[PDB]
Design a binder for this molecule. Structure first.
Ligand SMILES: *[C@@H]1O[C@H](CO)[C@@H](O[C@@H]2O[C@H](CO)[C@@H](O)[C@H](O)[C@H]2NC(C)=O)[C@H](O)[C@H]1NC(C)=O
Ligand SMILES: [Zn+2]
Lengths: 333, 55
């Protein structure tokens, strides 16, 4: 018969499944390379940028105070001792009762977070603009006039305190003071304060149920949490003060706050989360070359992970990437 | 080379890190819409993969 040239059946049926499975392989090497070394090249870039720019030094400093700090068994336990777990887990269970989605697919975790918000706000912790008068009754703050601020005394020095706001009671003459602590275990005792300490303690609380948690910092003086919902598998915005669960617009639209930057901090990394929150009344970002900020985070996130293993380094990097696309785009998924 | 849209570069990153099951059919759809990358794929996929690893 031939040579006529046999046709086969179909042409180059170009194998994607081959080339797809291949790549995923190649990618992983690309990723595991990225999160390596700290080649002294980009090291100066860092050591240096932290001197060009204070918004840099600002994030660097905070990373140091905020990423590792809430991973502390000793603490986690104390908080757990201290909270009313019976009550929390009862209500969480009661709300799981009234069905928790068709797929109860780690949804429990979300119902827990939500109920912690409620306990914290309705029950546990209490807001404090001026303090009540230590000698006069409880409900009694608006007859306190403030005589400024000053350093901690011996006792309150223990609890990582910088400023103690002092106040005079016009109805009795005694001086209630309001130390401003950073030791979140102290807060468990005092059970009162402002966004600030509200947030300090609430981050720790979330961390004590072994959730994956973050401290979000808005440069225009507010602070809150991000928690990772395996059921929504993305980060979810948690603000304890407003007993709010998935409402990142809250600030920008409901409050009509104007904001410029938002930064997350956690054991696993530091990430610019502005785009989640600053969705109108945008202020000029005029603090740091956007290129440099990207770098800054990446270098800290990278540093934060030398002692992780290849499976960890990768699974994390993907979560991050899933985030970028969420922020870069306008939506979830 | 290489140039694909920002929107694709996104949905590529999206899946190659988040739904790798769908990486094949997305590559289907790219050679679908980009002639000159249907040529690079065949002519050598190993270059096409490493070019691709540039976004
Ligand atoms: C300080 O943090 C608190 C707690 O979220 C904020 O108090 C909210 O203020 C907004 C602005 O109008 C109101 O919508 C809410 O009613 C307030 N919370 C409550 C119930 O007190 C305050 O806005 C924060 N300061 C800022 C914006 O930096
Ligand atoms: Zn008094």
């Amino acid at each position: 018969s031939s040579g006529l040239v046999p046709r086969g059946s179909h042409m180059n049926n170009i194998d994607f499944d081959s080339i797809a499975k291949m790549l995923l392989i190649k990618y992983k090497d690309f990723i595991l390379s990225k999160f390596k070394k700290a080649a002294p090249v980009e090291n100066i870039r860092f050591q240096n940028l932290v001197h060009t720019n204070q918004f840099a030094q600002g994030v660097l400093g905070q990373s140091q105070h905020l990423c590792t700090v809430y991973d502390n068994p000793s603490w986690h336990s104390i908080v757990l001792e201290t909270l009313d777990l019976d009550l929390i887990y009862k209500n969480v269970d009661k709300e799981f009762a009234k069905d928790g989605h068709a797929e109860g697919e780690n949804i429990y975790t979300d119902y827990l977070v939500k109920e912690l918000l409620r306990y914290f706000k309705q029950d546990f912790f209490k807001w404090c603009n001026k303090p009540d008068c230590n000698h006069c009754g409880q409900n009694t703050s608006e007859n306190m006039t403030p005589l400024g601020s000053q350093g901690p005394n011996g006792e309150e020095s223990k609890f990582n305190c910088g400023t103690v706001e002092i106040y005079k009671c016009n109805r009795c003459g005694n001086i209630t003071r309001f130390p401003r602590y950073n030791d979140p275990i102290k807060l468990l005792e005092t059970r009162k304060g402002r966004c600030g300490e509200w947030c300090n303690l609430f981050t720790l609380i979330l961390k004590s149920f072994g959730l994956d948690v973050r401290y979000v910092w808005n440069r225009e003086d507010h602070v809150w949490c991000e928690y990772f919902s395996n059921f929504l598998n993305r980060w979810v915005h948690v603000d304890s003060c407003e007993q709010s669960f998935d409402q990142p617009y809250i600030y920008s639209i409901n409050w009509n706050k104007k904001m410029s930057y938002c930064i997350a901090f956690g054991k696993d990394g530091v990430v610019d989360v502005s785009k989640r929150y600053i969705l109108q009344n945008e202020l000029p970002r005029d603090q740091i070359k956007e290129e440099d900020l990207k770098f800054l985070c990446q270098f800290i996130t990278k540093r934060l992970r030398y002692s992780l293993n290849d499976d960890e380094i990768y699974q994390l990097a993907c979560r991050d990437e899933q985030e970028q696309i969420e922020l870069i785009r306008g939506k979830t998924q | 080379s290489i140039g694909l849209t920002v929107e694709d570069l996104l949905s590529l990153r999206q899946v190659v890190s988040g739904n790798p099951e769908a990486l094949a059919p997305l590559l289907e759809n790219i050679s679908a819409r980009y002639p000159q990358l249907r040529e690079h794929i065949m002519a050598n996929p190993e270059v096409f993969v490493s070019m691709l690893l540039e976004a």
